[PDB]
Structures are given as structure tokens and as C-alpha cells.
Scaffold this active site. Structure first.
Site, PDB file in Angstrom:
ATOM      1  N   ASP A   1       0.737  -1.356  -0.006  1.00 19.62           N
ATOM      2  CA  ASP A   1      -0.011   0.047   0.042  1.00 19.62           C
ATOM      3  C   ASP A   1       0.950   1.202  -0.027  1.00 19.62           C
ATOM      4  OD1 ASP A   1      -1.773   1.950   0.303  1.00 19.62           O
ATOM      5  OD2 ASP A   1      -2.620   1.193   2.289  1.00 19.62           O
TER       6      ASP A   1
ATOM      7  N   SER B   1      -0.554  15.287 -12.401  1.00 16.22           N
ATOM      8  CA  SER B   1      -0.614  15.109 -13.567  1.00 16.22           C
ATOM      9  C   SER B   1      -0.930  16.341 -14.379  1.00 16.22           C
ATOM     10  CB  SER B   1      -1.822  14.270 -13.693  1.00 16.22           C
ATOM     11  OG  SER B   1      -2.136  13.869 -15.058  1.00 16.22           O
TER      12      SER B   1
END
EC number: 3.4.23.22
Length: 330
Positions: A35, A199
Site C-alpha cells: 500500500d 498530472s
């Protein structure tokens, strides 16, 4: 040193991925959810409330000759899906794919929430976010990666998650045969303890690319892709019959649909998520309404590049002095 381990989807929808981890001496192998959105290595154990264990493999510290109770230490964590667990702490030897750390904090669950109990396939979590998020008190503990880093050939790990198939976590090296083209690296903020990056934009299907900054986290422990409501609405608008359902808890779409791809930007590079990766199947058994793999982050407070996004790429988690993230197509 290096390590390399295969990671395997827990079910037919790729809801999560499990990777075998050797704990203790002799080894006790548990299948953990790696994770990158948390920083605790915790396990079902001989200390876990019996009614809260249902099929998981447990760690029994008393059977490990290298286990040592970390005196006074406790832990308690909650995740974005509302699940939680807590307990006490041992140090022990932990190996992943041939890479060994001695003295790793292994957090032994005394309590786990219902969603963990109900998932027989996940024996615990291995956190790979920054150690500043680790919940052990009163002495915060380091992640497996943090402990291994100085010994690694290169201070990196990579996630290569499969679509309906096994993949690989590598530690300490970049497998140059595992991706196509080049790896594009992008800046990371560690300010919130996550692999947080920006992004450069998105496209829907064969549509034009929209240049827009989208701050979010690379999170292998989250199944879906959670993005701003504007972006998600633009995606689902291209699927006839798709709608946001408050009762279901997100966007659903007719199971008869053919889903468009979704592209996200990494610098000047582009990662394409095929439409099929965005199908999470019937909302309930036998339904013709299917759950979408791209959902709104509104009210999460952060955008999350979860498995839906990451499995479309070869992803480098570069833990150099100034961390960065790298993405390649594959």
C-alpha cells in the site's frame, strides 16, 4: 541488494493485490496488500480478537525466535474506505522476494474492522508511503522500504500491477524489460506523507487532451481512480446511460456498454487506461448496472491515482534524497 515478488489480484475484479511476505524465524508467509498510500506494516495475528478472524493466515510471534515485543508501542490506523485496525508491535525479520530487513516493525492486530475480517485473502498491509505517516506510538517506526533503502542497489521500488493477471513489485532495481519506451519522471511532494504528484491533464477516449494540473497520490492500496468531479463527469458523459447514483455511491453504467479509454498526463508523456480497466462489474450479483472504475474525489479532499490508473503503467517510486515518481507505458 534487491528483491522481486509477484503480486496477485485477490479476485476477478482486481479489487486489490496480495504479495507474499516472509515474517519471523522460521518464516511465516503472509499475503499482504502493498500500500503506497499508508506506512504501517500490520498483520492478522495470534493476538487478533478471534471473532474478527475469518480465514486469514495469522502471524504468531511466540513461534518466531527473532520476534521481540516493542515494549509500550501501540498502533491504530484508519483508511479512506472507512476501515481500521489497531494493536501492539513486535520487531522481527521480514523478507520480500529475497530482500531481507532485520528489526522491522511488525504491527500485530488486536482489533480489525469488519471489512478486513470479511476479506479472507488479505492477511495484512505493508505500507510503502513515507514513514512520517506511520502510526506507531510513542515511537514512530520506519516502513520496510525505508529500512531497506540504504542496502538497496538503488533506493527505489517499482509497481507493475497486472490487469486480471499477476504482476511484480521490485525493490532496488528497475527492470528495463518490463516497460515500453521511456520512463517519464515527475516531481513528488512528501508534505502530506504520500507519493503526491501533479498530472498534466487528461483525455477521454479518442478525444483531445485537456492540459490541466491534477494533484493526486499514487496509491496502490486504493482500487479505483478518483479525480475531480469535472473530469469524471466528462468521462461518463461519453458512456450512454451512465449516471451518478447516490444510492449506489458513485457512477454506474449499463453493463452492455463499451467503455472508452482514459488518458492521463505525466509531464509531456501519456498513460492510456483501456476502457476495460474501468469496468468493475455488476453492482450486485445478476444486475445489469455496472460500477465504474473512475469516480469523483469530491469530498475525499485529495485525488487518488489508484490501481485502475497504476496498473496501466510501470511505476517507479524513487526514494532518493529528493523523491520522484516515474511512469512508463507497458
Amino acid at each position: 541488494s534487491t528483491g522481486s515478488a509477484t503480486t496477485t489480484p485477490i479476485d476477478s475484479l482486481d479489487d486489490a493485490y496480495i504479495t507474499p511476505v516472509q515474517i519471523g524465524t522460521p518464516a511465516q508467509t503472509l499475503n499482504l496488500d502493498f500500500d503506497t498510500g499508508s506506512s504501517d506494516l500490520w498483520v492478522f495475528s495470534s493476538e487478533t480478537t478471534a471473532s474478527e478472524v475469518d480465514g486469514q493466515t495469522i502471524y504468531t510471534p511466540s513461534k518466531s525466535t527473532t520476534a521481540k515485543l516493542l515494549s509500550g508501542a501501540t498502533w491504530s490506523i484508519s483508511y479512506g474506505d472507512g476501515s481500521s485496525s489497531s494493536g501492539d508491535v513486535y520487531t522481527d525479520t521480514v523478507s520480500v522476494g529475497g530482500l531481507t530487513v532485520t528489526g522491522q516493525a511488525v504491527e500485530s492486530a488486536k482489533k480489525v474492522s469488519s471489512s478486513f475480517t470479511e476479506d479472507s485473502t488479505i492477511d495484512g498491509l505493508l505500507g510503502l508511503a513515507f514513514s512520517t505517516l506511520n502510526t506507531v506510538s510513542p515511537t514512530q517506526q520506519k516502513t520496510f522500504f525505508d529500512n531497506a533503502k540504504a542496502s538497496l542497489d538503488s533506493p527505489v521500488f517499482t509497481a507493475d500491477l497486472g490487469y486480471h493477471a499477476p504482476g511484480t513489485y521490485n525493490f532496488g532495481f528497475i527492470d528495463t524489460t518490463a516497460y515500453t519506451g521511456s520512463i517519464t519522471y515527475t516531481a513528488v511532494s512528501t508534505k502530506q506523507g504520500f507519493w503526491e504528484w501533479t498530472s498534466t491533464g487528461y483525455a477521454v477516449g479518442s478525444g483531445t487532451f485537456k492540459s490541466t494540473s491534477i494533484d493526486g497520490i499514487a496509491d496502490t492500496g486504493t482500487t479505483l481512480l478518483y479525480l475531480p468531479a469535472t473530469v469524471v463527469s466528462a468521462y461518463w458523459a461519453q458512456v450512454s446511460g451512465a449516471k451518478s447514483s447516490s444510492s449506489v455511491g458513485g457512477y454506474v453504467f449499463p453493463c452492455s456498454a463499451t467503455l472508452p479509454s482514459f488518458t492521463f498526463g505525466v509531464g509531456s508523456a501519456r498513460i492510456v487506461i483501456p476502457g476495460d480497466y474501468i469496468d468493475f462489474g455488476p453492482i450486485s450479483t445478476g444486475s445489469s448496472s455496472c460500477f465504474g472504475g473512475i469516480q469523483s474525489s469530491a469530498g475525499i479532499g485529495i485525488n487518488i491515482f489508484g490501481d485502475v490508473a497504476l496498473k496501466a503503467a510501470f511505476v517507479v517510486f524513487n526514494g532518493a534524497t529528493t523523491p520522484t515518481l516515474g511512469f512508463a507505458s507497458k
